[PDB]
RNA sequence: CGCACGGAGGCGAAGAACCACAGAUUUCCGAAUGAGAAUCUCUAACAAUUGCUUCGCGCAAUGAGGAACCCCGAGAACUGAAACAUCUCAGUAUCGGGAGGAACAGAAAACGCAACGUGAUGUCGUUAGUAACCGCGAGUGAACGCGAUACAGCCCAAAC
RNA sequence: GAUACAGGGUGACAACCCCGUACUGAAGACCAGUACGCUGUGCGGUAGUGCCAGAGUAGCGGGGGUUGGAUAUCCCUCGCG
């Protein structure tokens, strides 16, 4: 069975969303929906996801931009992992 | 032209096939990419 | 004494005289309106069916078939074929109507194998034949001392390969001695001069 | 329906099958067209039955003319399974026969005569 | 090196199901450091982590569930 | 710790690598079978055709592949005849259907070295370029027998 | 040395450096669910009896095709039987 979250997308623009807009970027499995990416991020990091924006990258993988709520901080999540 | 999901997955792989033989393979075999494609001179599928 | 079966056999010796004459005039009216291949519960000729191998068992099917009459539905020549190779309505085929009938019937039933067939009459535009079919996978036949041969892997699609009784007769394999040098063991092995 | 030259009434048919029902509980009967034909040929048939719903008709066709050239009386039954249950079978019979009735001979004599009156 | 065949058969269908996650997370936490290209890599563990998750999934089918 | 001699790191006496056998896993498209689709998507699926049937897709069958071989069908022209039409090329090419590890054939309504004889079927040798055919031209061409290989002989329909 | 002087390897021409090679022995497949054996069954003979033994068939005629098949090849087709 396939896993949703593969690995985090850690690029310079992935920081411009982490610092400024409180968003965590992951490169997920292409068969996953915005609702499946949402539940998956919560069940692995104990956070609260408000919005998920997807894009099908030119690498065949799916890039998921996950926005957290004010109660959780993106800069603080990227530290432990 | 509007590409579909699969068409994208394919054109994506073809781009990774355009990467050179890494520096270490030369040092391991003790001394050529044959699927060398150009965006102008060559033709892909579809 | 005579069998009740022998009274159907003796009737079919002349399918245009008496009781059978009035029967076939009636039946064909419904048959002309019936399809190409119609599965029928009971055969029209009991003696003939039983003689060919039919039993009143589970997995022993009978089906009537109707094929067009005459010669070949042969066209003309598009590309340059000589005077000799230009006959349109004067030439016929190498498989008799009974063989087409058996094949059409085995394709209608893609799991059942052809046992044998017989004629059930004809009118001006078509010929009717009833084909006995057997289910090779039914245990009712798998343990039958008189029919379990038809369940062998090598008997699969036996009509299409001409291994039918109707098949071997058209292939010119009836005679054991003279005029059967080009027909036995097979036509293809003898270069097709049968 | 082609081998039938006369319609046998329901009232007479009830009287005919009742006689067959007691013929298996006393003497002997013949169940199945093959055994009934040999009965007419061997002469051992007293009264022969024939079903009217036999498809194909060929299995029966001979019975009306055979029973006539052998003097053996015949009678028509509408349904196949009615004659089947009457012979004492679970299935159905196309034609039945009575070989030496037994405690029915006082009715078979009349059934055979009620058919001659009906031609 | 750390997880052998015997040590997996000495577990319960609930200890394996929990060891699965404890390795599946360790993998994602190794794959994340490989996403940044960081130097504190241990090339042998990331390979053996796959082999381990495979072993536990294999034994899981073998033991009923 | 493949090809493939790097770097780094790892595994191995808890007996690894490697190999033999059995098994686990085995994405999607694919006969492709819930429906549609350029390998994707859409709201429970033997789709289709059959058999049996508890008449419910409940139990089953077919589908497609494989170098060639095999069996049943369809069936050319160049070419040869010093042209060409019957004939030849040739039942060759190619096409439609189908089976198996082989296929097909097969236990005489036979043979007819006519006998007081042989005794299922393939195949090999020979019979023989014979008999036979043919604008009697070019060409086409068996068989019975014989010697060998291998051997094997049975089952219904009906009567009762 | 040799029941081993087939072959290859090895920094040059190797039976005795190395793999192998002879001899001997082990496994699988195939032969083959065959042969052999066994189990059940029952082979056979005499006289009496016109009870039974497969139809559009055997065969004939017209048209086609094919064959070495010549009147005497096999086949399809229409009619008759
Ligand atoms: Cl078939
Ligand atoms: Cl002889
Ligand atoms: K020509
Ligand atoms: Mg989008
Ligand atoms: Mg690039
Ligand atoms: Mg052959
Ligand atoms: Mg589909
Ligand atoms: Mg010429
Ligand atoms: Mg010719
Ligand atoms: Mg000339
Ligand atoms: Mg020729
Ligand atoms: Mg001869
Ligand atoms: Na281009
Ligand atoms: Na079939
Ligand atoms: Na990546
Ligand atoms: Na596999
Ligand atoms: Na069903
Ligand atoms: Na010439
Ligand atoms: Na010319
Ligand atoms: Na000529
Ligand atoms: Na021929
Ligand atoms: Na003819
Ligand atoms: Sr990229
Ligand atoms: Sr161009
Ligand atoms: Sr019935
Ligand atoms: Sr098939
Ligand atoms: Sr022999
Ligand atoms: Sr006979």
Curated annotation (Swiss-Prot), chain A:
Stored Pfam families: Ribosomal_L23
Positions of disulphide bridges: none
Biological processes annotated in GO: translation
Keyword rRNA-binding (UniProt): yes
One of the record's GO molecular function terms: structural constituent of ribosome
GO cellular component: ribonucleoprotein complex; ribosome
Family: Belongs to the universal ribosomal protein uL23 family.
Cited NCBIfam families: PRK14548.1, uL23_arch
Protein name per the record: Large ribosomal subunit protein uL23
Organism: Haloarcula marismortui (strain ATCC 43049 / DSM 3752 / JCM 8966 / VKM B-1809) (Halobacterium marismortui)
Gene for this chain: rpl23
From Swiss-Prot, chain C:
Keyword RNA-binding on entry: yes
Residue ranges, annotated region (Disordered): 71-92, 162-194
Gene Ontology MF terms: rRNA binding; structural constituent of ribosome
GO cellular component: cytosolic large ribosomal subunit
BP GO annotations: cytoplasmic translation
Keywords from the named record: Ribonucleoprotein, Ribosomal protein, RNA-binding, rRNA-binding
InterPro entries according to UniProt: Rbsml_eL15_core_dom_sf (IPR024794), Ribosomal_eL15 (IPR000439), Ribosomal_eL15_arc (IPR020926), Ribosomal_eL15_CS (IPR020925), Ribosomal_uL23/eL15/eS24_sf (IPR012678)
Spans traversing the lipid bilayer: none
PANTHER family for this protein: LARGE RIBOSOMAL SUBUNIT PROTEIN EL15 (PTHR11847:SF4), RIBOSOMAL PROTEIN L15 (PTHR11847)
Family matches, as NCBIfam families: PRK04243.1
Membership in a protein family: Belongs to the eukaryotic ribosomal protein eL15 family.
Subunit structure, as described in the record: Part of the 50S ribosomal subunit. Interacts with protein L7Ae and weakly with L44e.
Protein name listed in UniProt: Large ribosomal subunit protein eL15
Organism (species): Haloarcula marismortui (strain ATCC 43049 / DSM 3752 / JCM 8966 / VKM B-1809) (Halobacterium marismortui)
Gene: rpl15e
UniProtKB/Swiss-Prot annotation, chain D:
A Pfam family recorded for this sequence: Ribosomal_L7Ae
Keyword Cytoplasm: yes
Location in or out of the cell: Cytoplasm
GO-annotated cellular components: cytoplasm; ribonucleoprotein complex; ribosome
GO molecular function: ribonuclease P activity; rRNA binding; structural constituent of ribosome
Main location: cytoplasm
PROSITE patterns xref list: RIBOSOMAL_L7AE
UniProt keyword terms in alphabetical order: Cytoplasm, Ribonucleoprotein, Ribosomal protein, RNA-binding, rRNA-binding, tRNA processing
Gene3D superfamilies given in the database record: 3.30.1330.30
GO BP: ribosome biogenesis; translation; tRNA 5'-leader removal
Kinase keyword on record: no
Function: Multifunctional RNA-binding protein that recognizes the K-turn motif in ribosomal RNA, the RNA component of RNase P, box H/ACA, box C/D and box C'/D' sRNAs.
Protein family membership: Belongs to the eukaryotic ribosomal protein eL8 family.
Subunit structure, as described in the record: Part of the 50S ribosomal subunit. Interacts with protein L15e. Probably part of the RNase P complex.
Protein name per the record: Large ribosomal subunit protein eL8
Lineage, top ranks: Archaea, Methanobacteriati, Methanobacteriota, Stenosarchaea group, Halobacteria
Gene: rpl7ae
From Swiss-Prot, chain E:
Signal peptide location: none
Role, per record: Stabilizes the tertiary rRNA structure within the 23S rRNA domain (domain I) to which it binds. Located at the polypeptide exit tunnel on the outside of the subunit.
Gene: rpl29
Keywords: Ribonucleoprotein, Ribosomal protein, RNA-binding, rRNA-binding
Subunit comment: Part of the 50S ribosomal subunit. Interacts with protein L23.
A biological process term (GO) from this entry: translation
GO molecular function per UniProt: rRNA binding; structural constituent of ribosome
Family: Belongs to the universal ribosomal protein uL29 family.
TM region positions: none
Pfam families from the UniProt entry: Ribosomal_L29
Entry's Gene Ontology cellular component terms: cytosolic large ribosomal subunit
Protein's name according to its UniProt entry: Large ribosomal subunit protein uL29
